[PDB]
Paper text:
However, we were ultimately successful in creating a variant, designated as NeonCyan1, with a tryptophan-derived cyan fluorescent protein (CFP)-type chromophore, and two additional mutants with distinct spectral hues. To obtain insight into the molecular basis of the empirically determined biophysical and photophysical properties of NeonCyan1 and its variants, we determined the crystal structure of [name] at close to physiological pH (pH 7.5), [name] at acidic pH (pH 5.6), and NeonCyan1-T207D at close to physiological pH (pH 6.5).
At acidic pH, the distance to the nitrogen atom of the imidazolinone ring has increased to 3.34 +/− 0.16 Å, which indicates a weaker hydrogen bond and may even be consistent with Glu222 being deprotonated. This conformational change may help to sterically accommodate the Z,E stereoisomer of the chromophore. This observation supports the conclusion that the NeonCyan1 structure can accommodate the Z,E stereoisomer.
Numbering used by the authors: 9 to 67, 71 to 236
Amino acid sequence: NMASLPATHELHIFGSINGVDFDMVGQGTGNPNEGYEELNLKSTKGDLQFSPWILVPHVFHQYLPYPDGMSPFQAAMVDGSGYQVHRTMQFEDGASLTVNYRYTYEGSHIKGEAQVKGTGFPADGPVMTNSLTAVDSCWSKKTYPNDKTIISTFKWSYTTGNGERYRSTARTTYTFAKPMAANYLKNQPVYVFRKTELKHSETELNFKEWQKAFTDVMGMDELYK
């Protein structure tokens, strides 16, 4: 018997921000019945030369349960066929950031690879000058346009060192190797509430996340934003 939800994970998150290369690796844990995950990361390329906050929320929906059972992400892991993830973020100042994810599974252990490319950050904005201080909690909205796709959308805000909000919008595409169960396509959309904590230096990140999915939710349209 090999049927397993995740208990542990590791992330290799790498790429560039405004052409500057970064690379971080580390181990983490979570509880796939509660939606909790935490992750340690260490840089393999010296001091991050940009706000470490730009890697949140990108630093494993395999830990997210749904209101009534496994999420489609968990079902894809357990079945073994899995899924791929593409995220785009559009920032208020015209900057753009993409992340592509691939996973492999060794029983209850996940190996994540996340490739990041951020461009168009103003040279003196809060990202390149390292003056982001916090994130807002966040609702995501998950839709299923077909049986192999989930589209997720969210508004995102960082706090800056002057106490302003620095805003973006995010679109995430999930591609499933096997069709999702009919029940998922019927009980949509799904809203997920997420809270995060980040402790960081120049070279190290300690990330935590709490998340909970909500189904059958009326007039959530202008409130999740």
